Design a binder for this molecule. Structure first.
Ligand code: MG
Ligand code: MG
Ligand code: MG
Ligand code: MG
Ligand code: MG
Ligand code: MG
Ligand code: MG
Ligand code: MG
Ligand code: MG
Lengths: 59, 52, 143, 164
RNA sequence: GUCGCGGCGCGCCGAGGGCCCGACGCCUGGCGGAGAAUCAGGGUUCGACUCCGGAGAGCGGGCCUGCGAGACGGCCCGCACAUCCAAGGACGGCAGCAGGCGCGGAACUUGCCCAAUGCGCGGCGCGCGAGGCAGCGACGGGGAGCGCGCGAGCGAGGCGGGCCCACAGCCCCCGCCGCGGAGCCGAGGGCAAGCUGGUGCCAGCAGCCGCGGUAAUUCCAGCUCGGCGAGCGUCGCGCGGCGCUGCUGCAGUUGAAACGCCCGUAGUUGGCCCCCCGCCGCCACGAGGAAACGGGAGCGCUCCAGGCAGGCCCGUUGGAC
RNA sequence: CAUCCGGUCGAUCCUGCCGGAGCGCGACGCUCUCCCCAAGGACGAAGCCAUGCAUGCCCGCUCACCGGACGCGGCGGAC
């Protein structure tokens, strides 16, 4: 019978772009969501790179 | 000398009773409304004889 | 009176009770430590052992019966006990050199019933409860 | 640690010390039939709550009338009892509380209030109707049989508008 | 010498210090407290684990950097283990999160993410196995149900749409079809609950008393019946039962128990009397000092176990004590 | 939330213990429809450890490649 919620009204679209968490923008039709990558691969890459010395941009 | 020397009738098929609160209804009616001389007991021979 | 009752006599009363509460058999058996070091189960609900001999024990004078029991050796102690399998015809399910789980009787460590000098019960053999095997809930075709 | 460790919890009922007692079994079955109770945990819950109220009343009664704590706690307890309808309005003395009994608790259950309103044929019918969500309190659907109705909501209990 | 007082260390001098108001020694399957279990009142037992404090990172020692470490996801040595070697050499420390072996009666996924609470660095941010989310999960706690009625109605479940979510579930709401399933113990007494067939002191039951040597009211089966109930039963431990450890509150002629008698130090206990001053105990009040837990005021998470919320026209809305 | 019951005798009253009846903590066993909360290798092995992850950030210093690399330096790593 009863539904309760919240709302947030912004004066400009720029303000909504700055003061706003991303996932809200993604849920709304404001921006597009790049395909997320697994943090496990990122940690593996970071460790591998830390293993190398000097110029490690190869790995 | 053989263990298990001491160790056949079939099971009689009867409708299942009403379980849950319903069981409480019939028990209430069994011994507070529905009849159960010579005082009363719970399933002595004489009472069982009449129903048979 | 017989007991000291002065306002500055707490120490004596404490000492008297400390000394005298060792005269109860139960309190001694619990708080002395000999029983724990003598109990083969070391204060455990039940133990796991290996059966090595299947034997029958006569009952006491007013009764007449031969009860079925087995000799067990506990894995974690290597000592010997006698454990009794009560349920009818359940000896045939127990085989020599089999893994068993053995628990206690109702009383803590006294003999129960007409069985002389027996204080343990068999409950599981080969991983299956004896009570379940007796009711045919499961079968021991793995052994 | 997990925040779930700080969540509290408690029991709500007590079991009798002597279970096999003929008069107790008879009385409990009688009450169960009269109010159509599911199991015997409900009676134990009622006894628990009654014991809590009685203990509070005892502790307050041991003290003097003009004790600030006595006034505060008695006022709160009486207000709660009156609002809940367990105690009659015209009683405003702590002595009357000790005479209360579980049947008074039972009479304020939802089944009872809708039965005395002629809205249901029987307690069992009331329970069946409550489960199917054909009933409402203050415009809100309540499907808990053991829900207790306050006095101010007694006239606000009706059939659900959306029910068939 | 130390940041610093100090037998903390060294030299010299003197002789002292502790003990039945229990020293010293030995033992502990000994981390402590806030607290937990039990329940008339007085108490007994426990306290690995959420907060605080301490200690350790295979055992025993040493040290650099730095405000701060005698640090171990920092270095050096000895010992016990372990690894790679193209045999000259090199290398390691899960009582961090997952996972594996052994042990045991006994204990889960080698998952996703910093969006929330915080920390580090830093201006429009990064990172964090802290922490959060999900998975297994009958430790356990709370709420509903397997029908009501002479016909209607509603569940679980499936197919779709919303809401929620870092992404997804879950709860909740909206539409079309619609799986209605109770076991575990017992029936001689304690202790609520009895009819045929077998066996024959054998087989077996039985916490205790006891049953079974031709009706077995007690074994094994069928019928029936009772208790609790999505839970029931068995084993071990603690409290209670127990006024059978007795302060409240036991007993001591004969049941278990007054030293063979006297003197006597520590210890315990000591008649009556002063009208007011000082000191000790005592009672009351107060300050000061963490919460959580417990108690408790107010608030319809649909109720409840819970949580501190919440309503519009709010004590300065509240979280008092 | 101040409770007892069965057992020594040919019968009876006592002392006195044995056993039963309740709550909680764990393990074993049978069974299990729906929702909510929720503990989880502590129990004389502080025994042994393959595999992966658990501490980074950045103001200063750019003739680096086309300013992002990298490095010096600073803070933190003693929570
Ligand atoms: Mg220790
Ligand atoms: Mg700590
Ligand atoms: Mg350390
Ligand atoms: Mg170190
Ligand atoms: Mg390590
Ligand atoms: Mg560290
Ligand atoms: Mg005595
Ligand atoms: Mg004599
Ligand atoms: Mg004597």
């Amino acid at each position: 019978g009863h539904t309760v919620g919240f709302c947030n009204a912004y004066q400009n679209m720029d303000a909504l772009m700055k003061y706003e968490p991303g996932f809200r923008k993604i849920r709304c039709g404001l921006i597009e969501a790049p395909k997320p990558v697994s943090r496990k691969q990122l940690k593996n890459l970071k460790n591998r790179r830390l293993k190398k010395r000097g110029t490690e941009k190869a790995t | 000398t053989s263990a298990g020397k001491v160790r056949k009738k079939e099971k009689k098929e009867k409708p299942r009773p009403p379980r849950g609160r319903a069981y409480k209804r019939l028990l209430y009616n069994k011994n507070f409304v529905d009849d159960t001389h010579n005082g009363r007991r719970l399933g002595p021979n004489n009472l069982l004889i009449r129903q048979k | 009176m017989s007991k000291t009752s002065g306002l500055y006599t707490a120490r004596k009363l404490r000492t008297v009770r400390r000394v005298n509460r060792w005269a109860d058999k139960k309190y001694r058996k619990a708080h002395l430590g000999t029983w724990l070091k003598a109990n083969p189960l070391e204060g455990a609900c039940m133990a796991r052992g290996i059966v090595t001999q299947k034997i029958g024990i006569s009952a006491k004078q007013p009764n007449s019966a031969v009860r079925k029991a087995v000799r067990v050796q506990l894995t974690k102690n290597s000592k010997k006990i006698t454990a009794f399998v009560p349920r009818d015809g359940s000896i045939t399910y127990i085989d020599n050199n089999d893994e068993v789980l053995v628990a206690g009787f109702g009383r803590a460590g006294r003999a129960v019933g007409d069985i002389p000098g027996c204080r343990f019960k068999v409950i599981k053999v080969a991983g299956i409860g004896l009570l379940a095997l007796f009711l045919r809930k499961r079968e021991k075709r793995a052994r | 640690p997990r925040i779930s460790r700080h969540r509290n919890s408690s029991k709500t009922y007590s079991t009798p010390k002597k279970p096999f007692t003929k008069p107790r079994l008879d009385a409990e079955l009688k009450l169960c039939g009269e109010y159509g109770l599911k199991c015997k945990r409900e009676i134990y819950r009622a006894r628990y709550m009654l014991a809590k109220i009685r203990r509070t009343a005892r502790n307050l009664l041991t003290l003097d009338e003009n004790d600030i704590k006595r006034r505060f706690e008695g006022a709160a307890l009486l207000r709660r009892l009156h609002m809940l309808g367990i105690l009659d309005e015209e009683k405003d003395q702590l002595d009357y509380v000790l005479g209360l009994r579980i049947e008074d608790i039972f009479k304020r259950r939802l089944q009872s209030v809708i039965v005395e309103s002629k809205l249901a044929k029987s307690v069992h019918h009331a329970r069946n109707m409550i489960k199917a969500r054909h009933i409402s309190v203050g415009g809100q659907i309540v499907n808990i049989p053991s829900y207790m109705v306050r006095i101010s909501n007694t006239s606000r209990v009706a059939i659900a508008d959306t029910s068939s």
